[PDB]
Amino acid sequence: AYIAVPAVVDSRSSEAIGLLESFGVDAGSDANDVSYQDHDYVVDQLQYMLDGYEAGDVIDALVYRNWLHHSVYCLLPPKSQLLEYWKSNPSVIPDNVDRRLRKRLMLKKDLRKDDEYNQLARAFKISDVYAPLISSTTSPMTMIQNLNQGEIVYTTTDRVIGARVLLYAPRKYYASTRVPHSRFNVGTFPSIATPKCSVMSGVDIESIPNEFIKLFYQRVKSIHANILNDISPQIVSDMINHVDVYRVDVVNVLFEVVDVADGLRSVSRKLIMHTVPVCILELLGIEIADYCIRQEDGMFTDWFLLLTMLSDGLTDRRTHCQYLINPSSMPPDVILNISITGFINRHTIDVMPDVYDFIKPIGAVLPKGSFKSTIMRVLDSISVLGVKIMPRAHVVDSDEVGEQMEPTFEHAVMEIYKGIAGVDSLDDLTKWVLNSDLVPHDDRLGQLFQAFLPLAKDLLAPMARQFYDNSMSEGRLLTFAHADSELLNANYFGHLLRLKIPYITEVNLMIRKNREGGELFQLVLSYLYKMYATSAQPKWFGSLLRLLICPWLHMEKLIGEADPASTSAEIGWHVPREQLDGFIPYVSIRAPRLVIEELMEKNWGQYHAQVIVTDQLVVGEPRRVSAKAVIKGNHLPVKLISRFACFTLTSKYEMGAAYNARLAFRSD
Amino acid sequence: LPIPPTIYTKPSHDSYYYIDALNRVRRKTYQGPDDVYVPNCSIVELLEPHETLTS
């Protein structure tokens, strides 16, 4: 039997990962009948052959391939180097060539001037000696039938697909550079070749991570959709019957919105919720029964909030559109009770984003009405292995750059009404800009934005430059702010993560009390930030919290029982001499024993900086004093930490003049 | 034609430069942000004579 999954499979590591269990297939006996087939080389040959041909020819060739019938290529030297390989060691010559040319290959004479060997070599062609001989320009449909029929196939080019490629001659002759199957074979790239070939249902084409497997499966569903064999995970389970971090199992829940407000059951809305991690659902004990997501004052129950912030946005089931819930308790619609029905897919994603390359600060961009103080209070109370994940002591609020100025920016843009001709009061301005529907007019926003842009370009940007430079000097921090061009106009070093909450912000604006000015002014100001920013498609907020929280749970499952001394580590700057030993924390690491004993001998002595220590010790208990460190050369890459260890992202610099220190590793 | 005497006597250069918070050497602007260029002052003091060109 043949089954096709949406993952890169190998014969080696895919069983140690537990890949079918990671899709949800229950094969718990481990009767080792599911033999694997490595597909690294066919994915790489797919990568190489999408250079040369059309993807239509490529995929429609690759589909009709019996993966059970073993075959292998053997590519050749070029036509005027193959005779040179036949000249030395004349014993390795097939019996097909010519008795007139064999006698002329096998002799000892140098054949410098060729009077008839020239003719015998020019009239020679490879096509009458080696029978397949695919070509260089073969229209690669026929490659697959050539490999299905035979088992050794001769070729003269590199861009082939389907099997491994063995060399005919030794390596100095070129100018271009069996398997155990036990009847339940699984591995990607489906086949229409034989009955008993199956394709795994479950995960959508929309949510496949490799994008070449996703391109392939999009084509194999856009044609051939009637003749496939889609089977569920449970049908696969019935047919059967260096631990990595940053790879979570992930599902989507299928809840709905219900009221019991009159003592009667009544279903109102229909929702789905994408990419929630499995470990958090195992933590919270989430099951099918009726849940309530409000507690005692209208605020969400601090686990539903973590669930919604942890994943991406919602989606309606009837309209297939994006959905944003009402945070306010005032209904055109509210959600008081829900009921969770089922889980739909079980793929895996890389939690680590592509943009994260070096150890540098993180700049998050949110709109105004995001749940800032509440999400900070929730992430404050997490401490996995003795270390706090995201402390409050080095996270930067959005208005912290605005409150340090002496005309105190919000108070400065309260005074915008005097420049406008006919408003001459703040309450009259907030009445005039709006419609009395709270969607504003575009022309009032245009006039106020022309009045607002010199306040945000001149009187904000150099103060922001000084502030973010000071915050980069005193450690590696995480800066919440608004309107991402606030991070683009002011030259901000570090990562940039445009984010978006899954809730409606603009009603969240006017619920809060004792904020700055009237709430209508806060909402107008929020609209001005939103008009100010960009046109870039941001993200959802879920990726950053998945990165913050979900890798530490796998490390808690892994090394929750070993010793802190031999499974903890610490890295930072180190100055040799002693005057009135010096060490500043830079990053802390939790890892098992073998990973740290691999970490010790890496070349941590490449990077250097300038280290400045002042003498203002602070409220913390051990004898450590605040300091400053400014990196000079290159930045620390994350591969030089690991893929396997789990480190803290952001921290402070706490231990006078400059010192010119170099960083090193320390552990027990 | 007359030459003013204020060319030959120019003050010291220590008040024109400062240090940024990231240890960047940048100069202090007095007249506009386009005043970021070489001052005209006081070269005789930070100097050591040549070994055979004594002047």
UniProtKB/TrEMBL annotation, chain A:
Q: Does the keyword ATP-binding apply?
A: no
Record's superkingdom?
Viruses
Q: Which GO terms of the molecular function aspect are on file?
A: structural molecule activity
**Record field: transmembrane:** none
Q: Which Pfam families match?
A: Reovirus_Mu2
Main localization category: host cell
> Any one cellular component term from GO for this entry?
host cytoskeleton
Where does the UniProt annotation locate this protein? Host cytoplasm, Host cytoskeleton; Virion
Keyword annotations for this protein?
Capsid protein, Host cytoplasm, Host cytoskeleton, Virion
For this entry, the protein name equals Mu-2 protein
Please report the organism this UniProt entry assigns to the protein: Mammalian orthoreovirus 3
From TrEMBL, chain B:
Q: Where in the cell is it found?
A: Virion
Q: Which family does it belong to?
A: Belongs to the reoviridae RNA-directed RNA polymerase family.
What's the protein called, per UniProt? RNA-directed RNA polymerase
According to its UniProt entry, this protein's organism is Mammalian orthoreovirus 3
Q: What is the lineage of its organism?
A: Viruses, Riboviria, Orthornavirae, Duplornaviricota, Resentoviricetes
* GN (gene name): L1
